[PDB]
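Protocol step 4 of 6.
Sequence for laminin (Mus musculus) entered exactly as in the expression construct, tag removed. Do not edit the line below.
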Amino acid sequence: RPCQCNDNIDPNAVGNCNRLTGECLKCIYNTAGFYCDRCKEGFFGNPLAPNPADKCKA
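Step 5 output, structure tokens:
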């Protein structure tokens, strides 16, 4: 983890982190927010759940 941020990013693809603001640019598990502490618009629920089945669903 080069850039500080919640645990919602993939080390495989590139760009997952913002090189200017230092914040998750594209959280992985349908989550959004400066710290991936939210749910992408369209899916609601809990973006900070241990299980992906209870994350942010429609």
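Step 6, annotate. Residues 17 and 49 are 21 Å apart (CA to CA).
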